[PDB]
Design a protein around this nucleic acid. Structure first.
Length: 183
DNA sequence: TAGGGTTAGGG
């Protein structure tokens, strides 16, 4: 058994009439659901337009994500890896992005180093090992852009990432302005 | 379209 958090998917854009039962009825087509629920307003009991489905195994979760697009109750919904309550606190933790910031990479880090660790998550579109525009010095971080936002999500939910022999920190890439707006 | 009475004691 893997952690509950890694076996759970967030399902956004739920139709106004989607219920625990209709949600379950759709996603069970890809595996055993150990949990399924539509978040509602504790007051009006009105649906908040989002929910969560949790499979018995991450393998089933991967099958579901490979089954996109998902149309539930006549509405195309938006499934995403479930981000923990703790991480949902960080700026832009719920953004749909295809690029990741990789910080703490050794000076002698080359692109092949990044590929040997990251390709396992999805198709890589661009790899950028950052250097100072002027001195040519290596700055110790890179940007890796994927073909699918789910690749990035599968990555940021894990804790450790080993590149060029040592762990590195991976975050969703925030724009220059999003960086400022967060600072 | 970010969570369900689900987050810092008392010694």
């Amino acid at each position: 058994k893997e952690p509950e958090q890694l076996r759970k998917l967030f399902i956004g854009g739920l139709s106004f009439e989607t219920t625990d039962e209709s949600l379950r009825s759709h996603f069970e087509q890809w595996g055993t659901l150990t949990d399924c629920v539509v978040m509602r307003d504790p007051n009006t009991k009105r649906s908040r337009g989002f929910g969560f489905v949790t499979y018995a195994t991450v393998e089933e979760v991967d099958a579901a994500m490979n089954a996109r697009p998902h149309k539930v109750d006549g509405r195309v919904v938006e499934p995403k890896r479930a981000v923990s309550r703790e991480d949902s606190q960080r700026p832009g933790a719920h953004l749909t992005v295809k690029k990741i910031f990789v910080g703490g990479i050794k000076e002698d880090t080359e692109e092949h180093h990044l590929r040997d660790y990251f390709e396992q998550y999805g198709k890589i579109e661009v790899i950028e090992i950052m250097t100072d525009r002027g001195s040519g010095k290596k700055r110790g971080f890179a940007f890796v852009t994927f073909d699918d936002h789910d690749s990035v999500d599968k990555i940021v939910i894990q804790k450790y990432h080993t590149v060029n022999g040592h762990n590195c920190e991976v975050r969703k890439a925030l724009s220059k302005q999003e960086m400022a707006s967060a600072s």
